[PDB]
Amino acid sequence: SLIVTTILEEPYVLFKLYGNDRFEGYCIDLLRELSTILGFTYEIRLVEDGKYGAQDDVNGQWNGMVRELIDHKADLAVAPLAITYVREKVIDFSAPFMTLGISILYRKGTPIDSADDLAKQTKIEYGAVEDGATMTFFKKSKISTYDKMWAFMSSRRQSVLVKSNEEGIQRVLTSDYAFLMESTTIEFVTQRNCNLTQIGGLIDSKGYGVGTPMGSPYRDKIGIAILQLQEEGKLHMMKEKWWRC
Amino acid sequence: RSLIVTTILEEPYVLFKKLYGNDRFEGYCIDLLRELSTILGFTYEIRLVEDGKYGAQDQWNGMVRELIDHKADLAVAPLAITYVREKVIDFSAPFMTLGISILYRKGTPIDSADDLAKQTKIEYGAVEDGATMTFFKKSKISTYDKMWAFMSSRRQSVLVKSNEEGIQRVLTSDYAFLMESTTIEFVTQRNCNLTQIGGLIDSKGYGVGTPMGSPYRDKIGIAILQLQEEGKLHMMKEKWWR
Ligand SMILES: C=C(C)[C@H]1CN[C@H](C(=O)O)[C@H]1CC(=O)O
Ligand SMILES: C=C(C)[C@H]1CN[C@H](C(=O)O)[C@H]1CC(=O)O
Ligand code: NA
Ligand code: NA
């Protein structure tokens, strides 16, 4: 039986009881499909510290699901966990089951048109989920524009970084603020808020993948089952199902 | 030890420079190989796959077979990451994302794959035994199953040996070519009378291939992720797609 770590994020994982019946969502459907294909059984556990996976700056310790895998406290991570260089250095990822990018969530009708338009001003504050792949992207970026956006963010950190996608969306809906956010979530959000839009194109390019501890014999099997799910159009069906202004 | 890298000629991924050894070659994949070489600290010799194939099971052939038998350490090419290939070799994280789509002439009523499947006047096909054809052959999706029904009975007349043969087919007859969206994009920039019909029919990536169990898999994956996040892969694509 596999211990599966995960986290609540709509519509990937949400509360529907006891055990695995507690949950539903894209990632739950995916987990089910993989289970069927590979013939394993599993117990789902929500990550204890409510984190995704970042390395702390003072000490070199990892948190979240990543840490969970690193420590072998979980066999798999199934969540909208971005596949990043930093993370890929300490755990293994399956082939991606979803492709996305960082982008801008904002109100419609403004002249803000791209990351650059944001970066060269201070009237409109902007931000990201604290210690998520996105913020980490801006923090590690050596691209002038994004480096400057990180200077701005890090200097105004206390009031422009947030603890969740929902908090950020609320920030956009209750103040002059632009939320650097993952595009799939954006797409989900703008279906439900008619005055929210994606500003500009995709700032980068990444995938969501299943996480395994480094050197896990399940990374490959899982990657293969995911590839299969993609080829037979299952993942697209799960997308339509969970995403359907 | 210098690594042996298997690849294959395909514009603009790998082409003969207009020389000896690695100097003979240029392209997006050669640039990529150079970046990987710098990041991971290795030297290499580039070799074109003898049988000139990517990799299909009849026994495997092409670059996949080269990897399986340890005749090469890496495959760097526009090699689609697929279920069937992944069961026998290891792919790095993808350096490019794409999908099967349709290359056809402009100005027709054809707007989708289903538009092709439901008629017979316009013929259509794909590279034989490549990832695209294999996609259709194995598909349970009604439209794609029908297109495959069409194609398998006409294997000799609608299937081609290369993207190039397919493009000339599109240009010289009433024919639609099922092809990879990145190559379609490369092509529609040089023949303004050609176009993509519809959107992407599936989703896949190209990855660097390594023999199953190779310790280079992870390091290469990490380098590709690094290249992606600093914008280098995108710059390489802009460079070669214009
Ligand atoms: C839901 C948030 C906290 C997570 C989900 N994916 C990103 C991650 O893998 O860290 C984070 C969002 C982001 O940073 O844009
Ligand atoms: C150049 C062609 C023969 C290759 C390239 N990628 C696909 C592959 O990985 O097999 C093939 C094309 C295709 O199948 O549409
Ligand atoms: Na890893
Ligand atoms: Na594999």
Q: Which of A186, A188, A190, A130 is nearest to A156 (CA)?
A: A130
What atom of ligand 1 comes closest to residue A185's alpha carbon? 1
Q: Which residues of A touch B219 (CB under 8 A)?
A: none
Q: Is A215 exposed, middle or buried (0-12, 13-18, 19+ CB in 10 A)?
A: exposed
Sign of CA dihedral B95, B101, B102, B107: negative
Long-range pairs of B166-175 with CB within 8 A, sequence gap ≥ 24 = B166/B103, B166/B125, B166/B126, B166/B127, B167/B103, B167/B191, B167/B194, B169/B125, B170/B103, B170/B104, B170/B105, B170/B194, B171/B105, B173/B123, B174/B121, B174/B122, B174/B123, B175/B122, B175/B123, B175/B124, B175/B125
Tokens of A19: 């055990």
User: In this structure, are residues A183 and A199 in contact, taking their beta carbons and an 8 Å threshold?
Assistant: no
Distance between CA atoms of residues B83 and B163, nearest Å: 22
Q: Scanning the structure block, which residue is given the tokens 């600093």?
A: B230
- Does the C-beta of B73 come closer than 6 Å to ligand 2? no
Tokens of B208: 């660097």
**Domains of chain A and any CATH numbers:** 1-100+206-245 (3.40.190.10), 101-205 (3.40.190.10)
- Does the C-beta of B129 come closer than 6 Å to ligand 2? no
Cβ within 8 Å of A, B 30-69: none
The answer to whether the bond into B12 is cis (omega within 30° of 0) is yes
CB of A219 within 8 Å of a chain B CB? The answer is no
DSSP states along A127-190: E-BTTSHHHHHHHH--SHHHHHHHHHHHHTHHHH-BSSHHHHHHHHHHSSEEEEEEHHHHHHHH
User: In this structure, are residues B56 and B134 in contact, taking their beta carbons and an 8 Å threshold?
Assistant: yes
What atom of ligand 1 comes closest to residue A84's alpha carbon? 9
User: In this structure, are residues B60 and B203 in contact, taking their beta carbons and an 8 Å threshold?
Assistant: no
CB of A16 within 8 Å of a chain B CB? The answer is no
φ and ψ of A20, to 5 deg: -65, -5
Hey, is B227 helix, strand or coil? helix
CB of B234 within 8 Å of a chain A CB? The answer is yes
Element (H, E) at A75: none
Tokens of B124: 């259509």
Taking CB atoms and an 8 Å limit, are B135 and A231 in contact across chains?
Answer: yes
Cβ neighbors of B104 (< 8 A, separation 6 or more) are B110, B122, B170, B176, B177, B194, B195, B197
Cβ neighbors of A55 (< 8 A, separation 6 or more) are A61, A62, A86
Please report, for residues A193, A197, A198, B228, the alpha-carbon distance to residue A107 in angstroms, rounded to integers and kept in the order given. Answer: 10, 6, 8, 29
Pairing type for strands B3-7 and B44-48 reads parallel
Cβ of B142: how many Cβ atoms within 10 Å? 10
Q: Please name the residue ranges forming H helices in chain A.
A: 26-38, 64-70, 85-88, 115-119, 133-140, 144-155, 157-160, 165-174, 183-190, 218-231, 234-243
Q: Please name the residue ranges forming H helices in B154-215.
A: 155-158, 163-172, 181-187
User: In this structure, are residues A98 and A238 in contact, taking their beta carbons and an 8 Å threshold?
Assistant: no
Distance B214 CA to ligand 3 centre (A): 13
- Does the C-beta of B131 come closer than 6 Å to ligand 2? yes
Element (H, E) at A63: none
What atom of ligand 2 comes closest to residue B179's alpha carbon? 15
Distance between CA atoms of residues B161 and B127, nearest Å: 5
Q: How far apart are the first and last CA of chain A?
A: 43
User: In this structure, are residues B187 and B101 in contact, taking their beta carbons and an 8 Å threshold?
Assistant: no
Distance between CA atoms of residues A204 and A109, nearest Å: 24
Residues A220, A225, A229, A231: what is their CA dihedral angle, to the nearest 10 degrees? 70
Distance between CA atoms of residues B88 and B106, nearest Å: 40
Distance between CA atoms of residues B221 and B226, nearest Å: 9
Taking CB atoms and an 8 Å limit, are B97 and A95 in contact across chains?
Answer: no
Q: Apex CA B223: angle with CA B36 and CA A94, to 5°? A: 130
Distance between CA atoms of residues B117 and B114, nearest Å: 5
Distance between CA atoms of residues A233 and B144, nearest Å: 11
Distance between CA atoms of residues B83 and A226, nearest Å: 8
Distance between CA atoms of residues A28 and A80, nearest Å: 11
DSSP states along B113-145: HHHHHT-SSSEEE-BTTSHHHHHHHT--SHHHH
Tokens of B33: 């190989």
Distance between CA atoms of residues A43 and B110, nearest Å: 49
Pairing type for strands A91-93 and B3-7 reads unpaired
Q: Scanning the structure block, which residue is given the tokens 């100005």?
A: B107
Distance between CA atoms of residues A140 and A117, nearest Å: 20
Pairing type for strands A177-182 and A125-127 reads parallel
Q: Which of A115, A72, A114 is nearest to A92 (CA)?
A: A72
DSSP states along B191-203: -TTEEEESS-SS-
B217 is in an annotated binding site: no
B83, B141, B225 member nearest A233 (Cβ): B141
B35, B79, B83, B135: which to substitute to probe chain A, counting the most A Cβ within 10 Å? B83
Burial B16-42 (b: 16+ CB within 10 A, else e): eeeeeebeebbbbbbbbbebbbeeeeb
Size of chain B, expressed as the number of residues it contains: 242
Distance B179 CA to ligand 4 centre (A): 24
Pairing type for strands A98-100 and A206-208 reads antiparallel
Taking CB atoms and an 8 Å limit, are A84 and B225 in contact across chains?
Answer: yes
Tokens of B181: 């969206």
Sign of CA dihedral B115, B129, B22, B223: positive
Q: Which residues of A touch B135 (CB under 8 A)?
A: 231
| Half-sphere exposure at residue B24, Cβ-oriented, CA atoms within 13 angstroms | 11
Cβ neighbors of A237 (< 8 A, separation 6 or more) are none
